[PDB]
Design a protein around this nucleic acid. Structure first.
Ligand SMILES: [Mg+2]
Ligand SMILES: [Mg+2]
Ligand SMILES: [Mg+2]
Ligand SMILES: [Mg+2]
Ligand SMILES: [Mg+2]
Ligand SMILES: [Mg+2]
Ligand SMILES: [Mg+2]
Ligand SMILES: [Mg+2]
Ligand SMILES: [Mg+2]
Ligand SMILES: [Mg+2]
Ligand SMILES: [Mg+2]
Ligand SMILES: [Mg+2]
Ligand SMILES: [Mg+2]
Ligand SMILES: [Mg+2]
Ligand SMILES: [Mg+2]
Ligand SMILES: [Mg+2]
Ligand SMILES: [Mg+2]
Ligand SMILES: [Mg+2]
Ligand SMILES: [Mg+2]
Ligand SMILES: [Mg+2]
Ligand SMILES: [Mg+2]
Ligand SMILES: [Mg+2]
Ligand SMILES: [Mg+2]
Ligand SMILES: [Mg+2]
Ligand SMILES: [Mg+2]
Ligand SMILES: [Mg+2]
Ligand SMILES: [Mg+2]
Lengths: 58, 52, 148, 52, 185
RNA sequence: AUAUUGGCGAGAGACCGAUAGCGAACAAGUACAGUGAUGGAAAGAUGAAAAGAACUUUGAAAAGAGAGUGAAAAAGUACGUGAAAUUGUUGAAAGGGAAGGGCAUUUGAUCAGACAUGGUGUUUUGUA
RNA sequence: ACGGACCAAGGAGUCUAACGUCUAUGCGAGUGUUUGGGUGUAAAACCCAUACGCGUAAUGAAAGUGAACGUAGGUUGGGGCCUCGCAAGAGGUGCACAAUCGACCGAUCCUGAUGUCUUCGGAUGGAUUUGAGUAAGAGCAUAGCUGUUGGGACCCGAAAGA
RNA sequence: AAAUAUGUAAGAAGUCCUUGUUACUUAAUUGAACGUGGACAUUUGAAUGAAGAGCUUUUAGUGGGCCAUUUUUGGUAAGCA
């Protein structure tokens, strides 16, 4: 017995029923996926400045 | 001895009489404590007048 | 109890909450754990990853008595002193009077150094102790006596 | 300071002795908790019934 | 007809008049619902909502947590408000002389507070002391530390504690969890 | 120390209430079917006490009409209470190849309440 | 298109073992008396010791190892609180929570100190690796709706098999 | 090379100024990223509307579809696919 194969009817209605939500962007986006050589430096740079602020504000 | 008090043991191992979550059960007296009266704002007339 | 069951609320409605088309048949998908490597593959992998297959090495005649080794952290090990003497020892923080804590009697096998015991020298006896756990103990002036 | 409790005699006339409250009468009164506890404990004296 | 933009007759979705039938708790709600109506202090409105919360939404607050808050700058003499229960913590050794208000104090926690020179206060006694929350401090226990939250949102590449009765070897540590056996997650 | 839908003797139930509960509350593993192994029902209730209708009359008789017992024969051995389907009689109504229904009203039948209030007051008796 | 001539009575998501989310209650780093013992107005109620169950530590196949550099970290946003200000606002403190970078424990790959039964021990310090972890505990028990599985399993139904 | 559809932006998580960190980078206080401190507030950066905004857990039913305008495939066509 044959049957309907594929259709996109009612799909946009279904998607828009709950709305198409924006990805809810954030401040400080994750550093996941950026070059690791930059990270290993970036880790020490933030470590260094943290010490500098701690001593200066002390 | 059976139930204990603030001065004696309850005779049941590790048992203490339960404690109240509210000091008193008369909320109206507290509401008329007047420490609250000073802090509170003046009241309406309990039946808002039908406007328009 | 029955009188709060939605069955009482389903009286008079022909499908009893099971719908018209699909109905409530006997076992549409199979019984029990059927279809793990089949039509029920999607649920099994998404919600129970690692179910199928063998990973470790077999242990024959495993007695769960050799492995009895309760763990103790350093934030505890002062509860093991009764409240009556706890205040006395804490204020009388000195050697030649250090309280003896038999962790084995309390039912513990190893001491783990989670951290921050006070500076009171104490004497604790345990079957095992981790490295950092003891370093915190003797930094306070205490010592550990190994027992069995 | 539990106020007092007058003691009566078998002949119906109050005696000289008076006793303080046993400090258990000041426990919180919880109709909800008693209702739930009563519902369960009342089931303890029951005999099983079943059709053959 | 009306081309409705949003769902009609939709509930607010926020719990009011808590479903617990604790008569003493309802009196406390009765007290604060009067305060928040006629005091305009944001403290009262916060406390009133906090009385409605369920058990998981009212996590226990340790006395050690109390010590941390009091260690904040300029907060030693503040009054601590805990809408919930306060649990004793043996991991702490020094306790200040603060005063705290909470629905319930565990026997250990109440003894610790009293032994430190402070006093345990019920919420109503706070109301007479601070009708508008003069010099107060509200603390909330951790919500994500619950065991049930571990399994929430389980899925591929999430690492969210798959629900299981018995743990150990050969319990979901096979094909689908390591690349030696099929794939890893 | 443990088991026990069997046997014997006991005590109980937020159990069931004659289409339930054992198949069986009754002359139930009975009546009954099958060559046979086997299969297997239905069926409780007048009334306090039969006091179960003496007697008269019509009829061949069964019975009927009286009489009588009974607190009640609207309890008469087809017997507590006696519903519905279905039927008879009486009464009302409508009806030109359905009836039944919804809104409104005419017509007919039938049905409740409101009509003291307190009071001016004594033109008054039982004089208050 | 199927069932329904009519009426009365009967008649179909229950119970249990184990559980998931949510809610209520008690207690709270503990929690659970009722296996059992004592007691009794006697299957009720009341009382009780030791263990045990779950939780307070995880990670490895395993041998094994084992959670603070620091105000238990930094940054961003935070209800509320505090100070100033009539207010507007300004500043401080900012729990829960959200994002991100770090810190500690386990596994894997490295580096290989002091020493030595010279092959043992693994100090120190790293790594686009990994964990269902730590980072001032939240859990235990009872009950309730709903949902799941095994059970006759919502009720009635085979052709067969022994 | 259209029309209709479609991505991005229209700020405080912004702009500008100064100098701190780093094992990264540069010939190099050269850069990069993150910062300290300083300055610019409701006309704070187009229109309109916001009915509250954001977020989590759990579960029911469903998983045979059909029709109309327009675009369009096979078929002569079909109340055809
Ligand atoms: Mg289909
Ligand atoms: Mg195809
Ligand atoms: Mg319906
Ligand atoms: Mg349903
Ligand atoms: Mg159906
Ligand atoms: Mg289905
Ligand atoms: Mg309308
Ligand atoms: Mg024959
Ligand atoms: Mg009668
Ligand atoms: Mg009768
Ligand atoms: Mg009769
Ligand atoms: Mg009839
Ligand atoms: Mg004719
Ligand atoms: Mg046919
Ligand atoms: Mg059919
Ligand atoms: Mg038919
Ligand atoms: Mg019926
Ligand atoms: Mg325990
Ligand atoms: Mg024990
Ligand atoms: Mg277990
Ligand atoms: Mg941080
Ligand atoms: Mg079941
Ligand atoms: Mg069958
Ligand atoms: Mg565009
Ligand atoms: Mg679905
Ligand atoms: Mg589905
Ligand atoms: Mg289907």
């Amino acid at each position: 017995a044959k049957s309907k194969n594929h259709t996109a009817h009612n799909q946009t209605r279904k998607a828009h029923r709950n709305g198409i939500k924006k990805p809810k962007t954030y401040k400080y986006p994750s550093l996941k996926g950026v070059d690791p050589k930059f990270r290993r430096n970036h880790k020490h740079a933030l470590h260094g400045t943290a010490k500098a602020l701690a001593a200066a504000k002390k | 001895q059976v139930w204990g008090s603030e001065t004696v043991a309850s005779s049941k191992v590790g048992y203490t009489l339960p404690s109240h979550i509210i000091s008193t059960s008369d909320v109206t007296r507290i509401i008329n404590s007047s420490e609250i009266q000073s802090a509170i704002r003046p009241a309406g007339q309990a039946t808002q007048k039908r406007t328009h | 109890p029955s009188r709060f069951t939605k069955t009482r609320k389903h009286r008079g409605h022909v499908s009893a909450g099971k719908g018209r088309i699909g109905k409530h048949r006997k076992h549409p998908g199979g019984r029990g754990m059927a279809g793990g490597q089949h039509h029920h593959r999607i649920n099994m992998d998404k919600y129970h990853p690692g179910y199928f297959g063998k990973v470790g090495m077999r242990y024959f005649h495993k007695q769960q008595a050799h492995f009895w080794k309760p763990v103790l952290n350093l934030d505890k090990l002062w509860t093991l002193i009764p409240e009556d003497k706890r205040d006395q020892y804490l204020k009388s923080a000195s050697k030649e009077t250090a309280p003896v804590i038999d962790t084995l009697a309390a039912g513990y096998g190893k001491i783990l150094g989670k951290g921050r015991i006070p500076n009171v020298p104490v004497i604790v006896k345990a079957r095992f102790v981790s490295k950092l756990a003891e370093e915190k103990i003797r930094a306070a002036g205490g010592v550990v006596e190994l027992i069995a | 300071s539990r106020p007092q409790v007058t003691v009566h005699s078998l002949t119906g006339e109050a005696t000289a002795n008076a006793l303080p409250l046993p400090a258990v009468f000041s426990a919180p009164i919880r109709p909800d908790i008693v209702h739930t506890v009563f519902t369960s404990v009342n089931k303890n004296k029951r005999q099983a019934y079943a059709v053959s | 007809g009306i081309d409705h933009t949003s769902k009609q007759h939709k509930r607010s979705g926020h719990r009011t008049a808590p479903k617990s039938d604790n008569v003493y708790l309802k009196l406390l709600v009765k007290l604060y619902t009067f305060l928040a109506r006629r005091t305009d202090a944001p403290f009262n409105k916060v406390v009133l909502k906090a009385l409605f919360l369920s058990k998981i939404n009212r996590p226990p607050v340790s006395v050690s947590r109390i010590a941390r808050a009091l260690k904040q700058e300029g907060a030693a003499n503040k009054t601590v408000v805990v809408v919930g229960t306060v649990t004793d913590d043996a991991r702490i050794f020094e306790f200040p002389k603060t005063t705290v208000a909470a629905l319930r104090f565990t026997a250990g926690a109440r003894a610790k507070i009293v032994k430190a020179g402070g006093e345990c206060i019920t919420l109503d006694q706070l109301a007479v002391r601070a009708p508008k929350g003069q010099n107060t401090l509200i603390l909330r226990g951790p919500r994500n530390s619950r065991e049930a939250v571990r399994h929430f949102g389980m899925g591929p590449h999430k690492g969210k504690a798959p629900r299981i009765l018995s743990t150990g070897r050969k319990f979901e540590r096979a094909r689908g969890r390591r690349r030696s056996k099929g794939f890893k997650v």
